[PDB]
């Protein structure tokens, strides 16, 4: 129980860092929408807002690529690099979140917690059994000690 | 004790992922050496290298 | 590594007091059983 409770703490920390990934991603996209003047994501983003933001940032990258051609720009190159680094910033955090989901994530946490609750139940039952068995053994010892005097009696 | 073991498991997993980060860096430097054509790093190397 | 080392050091210490406490529990359990037996025996021994 102690060993697997330490193991459960491990996955609890995993759940904590999953919270950290989600919060960092959601706040970073909110800030990047304002930075890039990309609308529709000022508030909290669910699955669709993030997807449309990714589509729009790729569209912005393509628009910068198109604009570079008619010039053919240094500020355009800096903007393109900013878009690329923002995209990568989205990318590794999204990869972390999806990888967390791949191995099971919350399902693994639930499975770990179920075993915690179960084992706590069996130890509680075992301690109770130890109590009544201790009572019975004490009764048996008293019975023997009495039974000596009972043979005399 | 149960709680303490829980956060110690957290800390041990943290050390484990730190080890994973070190291993990933050591693996990535050798692979990047071939792409960048930088001699002396394709093979085995240490933290000084 | 310093924080993890402190954590495992604290666990080792705590387990040390846990073993000490459990040993005290066994010793005092033996003493208490002896005391109860002595109480019943003395209840007989007043008459004796």
PDB file of C-alpha atoms in Angstrom:
ATOM      1  CA  UNK A   1       0.000   0.000   0.000  1.00  0.00           C
ATOM      2  CA  UNK A   2       2.776   2.447   0.860  1.00  0.00           C
ATOM      3  CA  UNK A   3       4.660   1.648  -2.347  1.00  0.00           C
ATOM      4  CA  UNK A   4       1.616   2.027  -4.588  1.00  0.00           C
ATOM      5  CA  UNK A   5       0.566   5.157  -2.679  1.00  0.00           C
ATOM      6  CA  UNK A   6       3.898   6.692  -3.652  1.00  0.00           C
ATOM      7  CA  UNK A   7       3.137   5.483  -7.180  1.00  0.00           C
ATOM      8  CA  UNK A   8      -0.275   7.178  -6.968  1.00  0.00           C
ATOM      9  CA  UNK A   9       1.392  10.393  -5.846  1.00  0.00           C
ATOM     10  CA  UNK A  10       3.520  10.130  -8.977  1.00  0.00           C
ATOM     11  CA  UNK A  11       0.450  10.137 -11.213  1.00  0.00           C
ATOM     12  CA  UNK A  12      -1.142  12.871  -9.102  1.00  0.00           C
ATOM     13  CA  UNK A  13       1.880  15.015  -9.951  1.00  0.00           C
ATOM     14  CA  UNK A  14       1.336  13.935 -13.559  1.00  0.00           C
ATOM     15  CA  UNK A  15      -2.230  15.246 -13.346  1.00  0.00           C
ATOM     16  CA  UNK A  16      -0.876  18.476 -11.848  1.00  0.00           C
ATOM     17  CA  UNK A  17       1.533  18.978 -14.740  1.00  0.00           C
ATOM     18  CA  UNK A  18      -1.315  18.198 -17.139  1.00  0.00           C
ATOM     19  CA  UNK A  19      -3.228  21.071 -15.536  1.00  0.00           C
ATOM     20  CA  UNK A  20      -0.127  23.213 -16.012  1.00  0.00           C
ATOM     21  CA  UNK A  21       0.096  22.300 -19.706  1.00  0.00           C
ATOM     22  CA  UNK A  22      -3.584  23.062 -20.301  1.00  0.00           C
ATOM     23  CA  UNK A  23      -3.489  26.400 -18.460  1.00  0.00           C
ATOM     24  CA  UNK A  24      -0.264  27.509 -20.153  1.00  0.00           C
ATOM     25  CA  UNK A  25      -1.616  26.580 -23.589  1.00  0.00           C
ATOM     26  CA  UNK A  26      -4.937  28.358 -23.091  1.00  0.00           C
ATOM     27  CA  UNK A  27      -3.356  31.540 -21.712  1.00  0.00           C
ATOM     28  CA  UNK A  28      -0.635  31.584 -24.379  1.00  0.00           C
ATOM     29  CA  UNK A  29      -3.146  31.339 -27.220  1.00  0.00           C
ATOM     30  CA  UNK A  30      -5.163  34.165 -25.645  1.00  0.00           C
ATOM     31  CA  UNK A  31      -2.068  36.376 -25.528  1.00  0.00           C
ATOM     32  CA  UNK A  32      -0.977  35.387 -29.047  1.00  0.00           C
ATOM     33  CA  UNK A  33      -4.402  36.250 -30.476  1.00  0.00           C
ATOM     34  CA  UNK A  34      -4.021  39.802 -29.161  1.00  0.00           C
ATOM     35  CA  UNK A  35      -0.392  39.956 -30.316  1.00  0.00           C
ATOM     36  CA  UNK A  36      -1.249  38.866 -33.874  1.00  0.00           C
ATOM     37  CA  UNK A  37      -4.556  40.808 -34.000  1.00  0.00           C
ATOM     38  CA  UNK A  38      -6.330  37.493 -34.605  1.00  0.00           C
ATOM     39  CA  UNK A  39      -9.958  37.664 -33.498  1.00  0.00           C
ATOM     40  CA  UNK A  40     -12.348  35.201 -31.890  1.00  0.00           C
ATOM     41  CA  UNK A  41     -10.117  33.948 -29.052  1.00  0.00           C
ATOM     42  CA  UNK A  42     -10.060  36.735 -26.448  1.00  0.00           C
ATOM     43  CA  UNK A  43     -11.891  34.511 -23.963  1.00  0.00           C
ATOM     44  CA  UNK A  44     -11.328  30.834 -23.000  1.00  0.00           C
ATOM     45  CA  UNK A  45     -10.771  28.475 -25.969  1.00  0.00           C
ATOM     46  CA  UNK A  46     -12.460  25.048 -26.261  1.00  0.00           C
ATOM     47  CA  UNK A  47     -11.489  22.550 -29.034  1.00  0.00           C
ATOM     48  CA  UNK A  48     -12.960  24.617 -32.020  1.00  0.00           C
ATOM     49  CA  UNK A  49     -11.400  27.965 -31.091  1.00  0.00           C
ATOM     50  CA  UNK A  50      -7.918  26.430 -30.882  1.00  0.00           C
ATOM     51  CA  UNK A  51      -8.394  24.664 -34.225  1.00  0.00           C
ATOM     52  CA  UNK A  52      -9.609  27.814 -35.991  1.00  0.00           C
ATOM     53  CA  UNK A  53      -6.740  29.783 -34.436  1.00  0.00           C
ATOM     54  CA  UNK A  54      -4.268  27.247 -35.834  1.00  0.00           C
ATOM     55  CA  UNK A  55      -5.903  27.488 -39.260  1.00  0.00           C
ATOM     56  CA  UNK A  56      -5.738  31.288 -39.113  1.00  0.00           C
ATOM     57  CA  UNK A  57      -2.089  31.354 -38.004  1.00  0.00           C
ATOM     58  CA  UNK A  58      -1.161  29.054 -40.892  1.00  0.00           C
ATOM     59  CA  UNK A  59      -3.165  31.378 -43.150  1.00  0.00           C
ATOM     60  CA  UNK A  60      -1.210  34.349 -41.765  1.00  0.00           C
ATOM     61  CA  UNK A  61       2.066  32.537 -42.457  1.00  0.00           C
ATOM     62  CA  UNK A  62       0.927  31.871 -46.030  1.00  0.00           C
ATOM     63  CA  UNK A  63      -0.143  35.511 -46.424  1.00  0.00           C
ATOM     64  CA  UNK A  64       3.308  36.640 -45.293  1.00  0.00           C
ATOM     65  CA  UNK A  65       4.831  34.226 -47.812  1.00  0.00           C
ATOM     66  CA  UNK A  66       2.650  35.719 -50.559  1.00  0.00           C
ATOM     67  CA  UNK A  67       3.493  39.287 -49.513  1.00  0.00           C
ATOM     68  CA  UNK A  68       7.218  38.527 -49.642  1.00  0.00           C
ATOM     69  CA  UNK A  69       6.854  37.629 -53.330  1.00  0.00           C
ATOM     70  CA  UNK A  70       5.432  40.973 -54.466  1.00  0.00           C
ATOM     71  CA  UNK A  71       8.281  42.701 -52.633  1.00  0.00           C
ATOM     72  CA  UNK A  72      10.627  40.448 -54.621  1.00  0.00           C
ATOM     73  CA  UNK A  73      10.821  42.544 -46.284  1.00  0.00           C
ATOM     74  CA  UNK A  74      13.230  42.388 -43.346  1.00  0.00           C
ATOM     75  CA  UNK A  75      10.340  43.331 -41.067  1.00  0.00           C
ATOM     76  CA  UNK A  76       8.302  40.764 -43.006  1.00  0.00           C
ATOM     77  CA  UNK A  77      11.024  38.208 -42.254  1.00  0.00           C
ATOM     78  CA  UNK A  78      10.873  39.119 -38.559  1.00  0.00           C
ATOM     79  CA  UNK A  79       7.083  38.741 -38.598  1.00  0.00           C
ATOM     80  CA  UNK A  80       7.403  35.357 -40.323  1.00  0.00           C
ATOM     81  CA  UNK A  81       9.879  34.230 -37.661  1.00  0.00           C
ATOM     82  CA  UNK A  82       7.498  35.430 -34.939  1.00  0.00           C
ATOM     83  CA  UNK A  83       4.654  33.435 -36.497  1.00  0.00           C
ATOM     84  CA  UNK A  84       6.887  30.358 -36.748  1.00  0.00           C
ATOM     85  CA  UNK A  85       8.027  30.560 -33.124  1.00  0.00           C
ATOM     86  CA  UNK A  86       4.463  31.142 -31.900  1.00  0.00           C
ATOM     87  CA  UNK A  87       3.333  28.123 -33.927  1.00  0.00           C
ATOM     88  CA  UNK A  88       6.087  25.991 -32.387  1.00  0.00           C
ATOM     89  CA  UNK A  89       5.113  27.294 -28.940  1.00  0.00           C
ATOM     90  CA  UNK A  90       1.611  26.010 -29.601  1.00  0.00           C
ATOM     91  CA  UNK A  91       3.066  22.814 -31.044  1.00  0.00           C
ATOM     92  CA  UNK A  92       5.142  21.404 -28.207  1.00  0.00           C
ATOM     93  CA  UNK A  93       2.452  22.119 -25.602  1.00  0.00           C
ATOM     94  CA  UNK A  94      -0.243  20.527 -27.767  1.00  0.00           C
ATOM     95  CA  UNK A  95       2.085  17.551 -28.222  1.00  0.00           C
ATOM     96  CA  UNK A  96       2.515  17.286 -24.448  1.00  0.00           C
ATOM     97  CA  UNK A  97      -1.253  17.385 -23.901  1.00  0.00           C
ATOM     98  CA  UNK A  98      -2.017  14.797 -26.581  1.00  0.00           C
ATOM     99  CA  UNK A  99       0.783  12.535 -25.320  1.00  0.00           C
ATOM    100  CA  UNK A 100      -0.649  12.796 -21.804  1.00  0.00           C
ATOM    101  CA  UNK A 101      -3.992  11.741 -23.268  1.00  0.00           C
ATOM    102  CA  UNK A 102      -2.409   8.897 -25.266  1.00  0.00           C
ATOM    103  CA  UNK A 103      -1.145   6.729 -22.401  1.00  0.00           C
ATOM    104  CA  UNK A 104      -4.509   7.073 -20.645  1.00  0.00           C
ATOM    105  CA  UNK A 105      -3.936  10.125 -18.476  1.00  0.00           C
ATOM    106  CA  UNK A 106      -7.103  10.666 -16.447  1.00  0.00           C
ATOM    107  CA  UNK A 107      -8.085   7.035 -17.055  1.00  0.00           C
ATOM    108  CA  UNK A 108      -4.785   5.942 -15.502  1.00  0.00           C
ATOM    109  CA  UNK A 109      -5.388   8.315 -12.587  1.00  0.00           C
ATOM    110  CA  UNK A 110      -8.874   6.886 -12.035  1.00  0.00           C
ATOM    111  CA  UNK A 111      -7.539   3.326 -12.158  1.00  0.00           C
ATOM    112  CA  UNK A 112      -4.837   4.254  -9.642  1.00  0.00           C
ATOM    113  CA  UNK A 113      -7.384   5.876  -7.315  1.00  0.00           C
ATOM    114  CA  UNK A 114      -9.712   2.867  -7.499  1.00  0.00           C
ATOM    115  CA  UNK A 115      -6.926   0.628  -6.205  1.00  0.00           C
ATOM    116  CA  UNK A 116      -6.185   3.161  -3.448  1.00  0.00           C
ATOM    117  CA  UNK A 117      -9.799   3.108  -2.263  1.00  0.00           C
ATOM    118  CA  UNK A 118     -10.028  -0.681  -2.530  1.00  0.00           C
ATOM    119  CA  UNK A 119      -6.827  -1.320  -0.588  1.00  0.00           C
ATOM    120  CA  UNK A 120      -7.831   1.168   2.102  1.00  0.00           C
ATOM    121  CA  UNK A 121     -11.038  -0.847   2.400  1.00  0.00           C
ATOM    122  CA  UNK A 122      -9.178  -4.142   2.818  1.00  0.00           C
ATOM    123  CA  UNK A 123      -6.790  -2.728   5.422  1.00  0.00           C
ATOM    124  CA  UNK A 124      -9.721  -1.283   7.372  1.00  0.00           C
ATOM    125  CA  UNK A 125     -11.454  -4.673   7.272  1.00  0.00           C
ATOM    126  CA  UNK A 126      -8.225  -6.439   8.249  1.00  0.00           C
ATOM    127  CA  UNK A 127      -7.698  -4.140  11.230  1.00  0.00           C
ATOM    128  CA  UNK A 128     -11.271  -4.776  12.348  1.00  0.00           C
ATOM    129  CA  UNK A 129     -10.700  -8.519  12.042  1.00  0.00           C
ATOM    130  CA  UNK A 130      -7.524  -8.136  14.086  1.00  0.00           C
ATOM    131  CA  UNK A 131      -9.549  -6.371  16.769  1.00  0.00           C
ATOM    132  CA  UNK A 132     -12.181  -9.087  17.153  1.00  0.00           C
ATOM    133  CA  UNK A 133      -9.557 -11.831  16.863  1.00  0.00           C
ATOM    134  CA  UNK A 134      -7.521 -10.155  19.609  1.00  0.00           C
ATOM    135  CA  UNK A 135     -10.664 -10.085  21.742  1.00  0.00           C
ATOM    136  CA  UNK A 136     -11.232 -13.787  21.046  1.00  0.00           C
ATOM    137  CA  UNK A 137      -7.632 -14.694  21.915  1.00  0.00           C
ATOM    138  CA  UNK A 138      -7.869 -12.737  25.165  1.00  0.00           C
ATOM    139  CA  UNK A 139     -11.073 -14.638  25.928  1.00  0.00           C
ATOM    140  CA  UNK A 140      -9.264 -17.917  25.214  1.00  0.00           C
ATOM    141  CA  UNK A 141      -6.401 -17.048  27.569  1.00  0.00           C
ATOM    142  CA  UNK A 142      -8.889 -16.070  30.267  1.00  0.00           C
ATOM    143  CA  UNK A 143     -10.714 -19.336  29.592  1.00  0.00           C
ATOM    144  CA  UNK A 144      -7.569 -21.408  30.152  1.00  0.00           C
ATOM    145  CA  UNK A 145      -6.592 -19.496  33.295  1.00  0.00           C
ATOM    146  CA  UNK A 146     -10.108 -19.964  34.651  1.00  0.00           C
ATOM    147  CA  UNK A 147     -10.283 -23.599  33.515  1.00  0.00           C
ATOM    148  CA  UNK A 148      -7.403 -24.517  35.802  1.00  0.00           C
ATOM    149  CA  UNK A 149      -9.397 -23.271  38.792  1.00  0.00           C
ATOM    150  CA  UNK A 150     -12.470 -24.887  37.231  1.00  0.00           C
ATOM    151  CA  UNK A 151     -10.840 -28.315  37.315  1.00  0.00           C
ATOM    152  CA  UNK A 152     -10.056 -27.618  40.951  1.00  0.00           C
ATOM    153  CA  UNK A 153     -13.639 -26.432  41.443  1.00  0.00           C
TER     154      UNK A 153
ATOM    155  CA  UNK B   1       3.859   8.800   6.166  1.00  0.00           C
ATOM    156  CA  UNK B   2       1.459   7.927   3.350  1.00  0.00           C
ATOM    157  CA  UNK B   3       1.292  11.572   2.277  1.00  0.00           C
ATOM    158  CA  UNK B   4       5.073  11.996   2.567  1.00  0.00           C
ATOM    159  CA  UNK B   5       5.638   8.915   0.419  1.00  0.00           C
ATOM    160  CA  UNK B   6       3.213  10.395  -2.115  1.00  0.00           C
ATOM    161  CA  UNK B   7       5.157  13.608  -2.637  1.00  0.00           C
ATOM    162  CA  UNK B   8       8.431  11.685  -2.498  1.00  0.00           C
ATOM    163  CA  UNK B   9       7.137   9.582  -5.374  1.00  0.00           C
ATOM    164  CA  UNK B  10       6.375  12.843  -7.157  1.00  0.00           C
ATOM    165  CA  UNK B  11       9.941  14.018  -6.518  1.00  0.00           C
ATOM    166  CA  UNK B  12      11.446  10.719  -7.666  1.00  0.00           C
ATOM    167  CA  UNK B  13       9.433  10.918 -10.886  1.00  0.00           C
ATOM    168  CA  UNK B  14      10.731  14.478 -11.247  1.00  0.00           C
ATOM    169  CA  UNK B  15      14.299  13.194 -10.953  1.00  0.00           C
ATOM    170  CA  UNK B  16      13.431  10.502 -13.502  1.00  0.00           C
ATOM    171  CA  UNK B  17      12.197  13.030 -16.046  1.00  0.00           C
ATOM    172  CA  UNK B  18      15.297  15.137 -15.375  1.00  0.00           C
ATOM    173  CA  UNK B  19      17.323  12.055 -16.308  1.00  0.00           C
ATOM    174  CA  UNK B  20      15.142  11.736 -19.412  1.00  0.00           C
ATOM    175  CA  UNK B  21      15.911  15.360 -20.325  1.00  0.00           C
ATOM    176  CA  UNK B  22      19.646  14.725 -19.972  1.00  0.00           C
ATOM    177  CA  UNK B  23      19.383  11.582 -22.117  1.00  0.00           C
ATOM    178  CA  UNK B  24      17.372  13.467 -24.746  1.00  0.00           C
ATOM    179  CA  UNK B  25      19.994  16.225 -24.896  1.00  0.00           C
ATOM    180  CA  UNK B  26      22.825  13.699 -25.231  1.00  0.00           C
ATOM    181  CA  UNK B  27      20.940  11.899 -28.007  1.00  0.00           C
ATOM    182  CA  UNK B  28      19.991  15.099 -29.836  1.00  0.00           C
ATOM    183  CA  UNK B  29      23.480  16.618 -29.954  1.00  0.00           C
ATOM    184  CA  UNK B  30      24.918  13.643 -31.861  1.00  0.00           C
ATOM    185  CA  UNK B  31      22.051  13.649 -34.370  1.00  0.00           C
ATOM    186  CA  UNK B  32      22.367  17.407 -34.929  1.00  0.00           C
ATOM    187  CA  UNK B  33      26.127  17.051 -35.454  1.00  0.00           C
ATOM    188  CA  UNK B  34      25.609  15.049 -38.654  1.00  0.00           C
ATOM    189  CA  UNK B  35      23.056  17.537 -39.993  1.00  0.00           C
ATOM    190  CA  UNK B  36      25.277  20.536 -39.210  1.00  0.00           C
ATOM    191  CA  UNK B  37      28.486  18.784 -40.382  1.00  0.00           C
ATOM    192  CA  UNK B  38      30.284  19.673 -37.137  1.00  0.00           C
ATOM    193  CA  UNK B  39      33.193  17.303 -36.569  1.00  0.00           C
ATOM    194  CA  UNK B  40      33.896  15.601 -33.255  1.00  0.00           C
ATOM    195  CA  UNK B  41      30.269  15.227 -32.131  1.00  0.00           C
ATOM    196  CA  UNK B  42      28.850  12.447 -34.334  1.00  0.00           C
ATOM    197  CA  UNK B  43      30.197   9.769 -31.993  1.00  0.00           C
ATOM    198  CA  UNK B  44      29.978   9.394 -28.241  1.00  0.00           C
ATOM    199  CA  UNK B  45      30.554  12.596 -26.284  1.00  0.00           C
ATOM    200  CA  UNK B  46      30.389  14.039 -22.775  1.00  0.00           C
ATOM    201  CA  UNK B  47      28.923  17.198 -21.256  1.00  0.00           C
ATOM    202  CA  UNK B  48      32.177  19.086 -21.854  1.00  0.00           C
ATOM    203  CA  UNK B  49      31.883  18.251 -25.548  1.00  0.00           C
TER     204      UNK B  49
ATOM    205  CA  UNK C   1      18.477  16.650  -6.029  1.00  0.00           C
ATOM    206  CA  UNK C   2      18.689  18.543  -2.723  1.00  0.00           C
ATOM    207  CA  UNK C   3      14.915  18.631  -2.211  1.00  0.00           C
ATOM    208  CA  UNK C   4      14.482  14.950  -3.087  1.00  0.00           C
ATOM    209  CA  UNK C   5      17.392  14.064  -0.798  1.00  0.00           C
ATOM    210  CA  UNK C   6      15.766  15.991   2.050  1.00  0.00           C
ATOM    211  CA  UNK C   7      12.455  14.243   1.346  1.00  0.00           C
ATOM    212  CA  UNK C   8      13.967  10.754   1.422  1.00  0.00           C
ATOM    213  CA  UNK C   9      15.992  11.675   4.517  1.00  0.00           C
ATOM    214  CA  UNK C  10      12.790  12.760   6.258  1.00  0.00           C
ATOM    215  CA  UNK C  11      11.111   9.514   5.173  1.00  0.00           C
ATOM    216  CA  UNK C  12      13.999   7.476   6.573  1.00  0.00           C
ATOM    217  CA  UNK C  13      13.830   9.367   9.872  1.00  0.00           C
ATOM    218  CA  UNK C  14      10.042   9.054  10.057  1.00  0.00           C
ATOM    219  CA  UNK C  15      10.232   5.322   9.368  1.00  0.00           C
ATOM    220  CA  UNK C  16      12.795   5.114  12.168  1.00  0.00           C
ATOM    221  CA  UNK C  17      10.364   6.638  14.655  1.00  0.00           C
ATOM    222  CA  UNK C  18       7.635   4.407  13.210  1.00  0.00           C
ATOM    223  CA  UNK C  19       9.656   1.277  13.941  1.00  0.00           C
ATOM    224  CA  UNK C  20      10.452   2.634  17.408  1.00  0.00           C
ATOM    225  CA  UNK C  21       6.769   3.345  18.058  1.00  0.00           C
ATOM    226  CA  UNK C  22       5.726  -0.109  16.858  1.00  0.00           C
ATOM    227  CA  UNK C  23       8.310  -1.732  19.119  1.00  0.00           C
ATOM    228  CA  UNK C  24       6.972   0.327  22.010  1.00  0.00           C
ATOM    229  CA  UNK C  25       3.481  -0.818  21.030  1.00  0.00           C
ATOM    230  CA  UNK C  26       4.486  -4.479  21.217  1.00  0.00           C
ATOM    231  CA  UNK C  27       6.297  -3.970  24.529  1.00  0.00           C
ATOM    232  CA  UNK C  28       3.403  -2.066  26.100  1.00  0.00           C
ATOM    233  CA  UNK C  29       0.923  -4.611  24.731  1.00  0.00           C
ATOM    234  CA  UNK C  30       2.871  -7.364  26.479  1.00  0.00           C
ATOM    235  CA  UNK C  31       2.968  -5.261  29.648  1.00  0.00           C
ATOM    236  CA  UNK C  32      -0.776  -4.561  29.480  1.00  0.00           C
ATOM    237  CA  UNK C  33      -1.636  -8.226  28.957  1.00  0.00           C
ATOM    238  CA  UNK C  34       0.608  -9.064  31.907  1.00  0.00           C
ATOM    239  CA  UNK C  35      -1.133  -6.358  33.944  1.00  0.00           C
ATOM    240  CA  UNK C  36      -4.610  -7.694  33.160  1.00  0.00           C
ATOM    241  CA  UNK C  37      -3.519 -11.229  34.018  1.00  0.00           C
ATOM    242  CA  UNK C  38      -2.031  -9.859  37.240  1.00  0.00           C
ATOM    243  CA  UNK C  39      -5.301  -8.079  38.025  1.00  0.00           C
ATOM    244  CA  UNK C  40      -7.336 -11.266  37.639  1.00  0.00           C
ATOM    245  CA  UNK C  41      -4.722 -13.241  39.560  1.00  0.00           C
ATOM    246  CA  UNK C  42      -4.751 -10.696  42.401  1.00  0.00           C
ATOM    247  CA  UNK C  43      -8.544 -10.836  42.500  1.00  0.00           C
ATOM    248  CA  UNK C  44      -8.046 -14.538  43.174  1.00  0.00           C
ATOM    249  CA  UNK C  45      -5.085 -13.959  45.500  1.00  0.00           C
ATOM    250  CA  UNK C  46      -6.963 -11.726  47.931  1.00  0.00           C
ATOM    251  CA  UNK C  47      -9.215 -14.692  48.677  1.00  0.00           C
ATOM    252  CA  UNK C  48      -6.161 -16.968  48.543  1.00  0.00           C
TER     253      UNK C  48
END
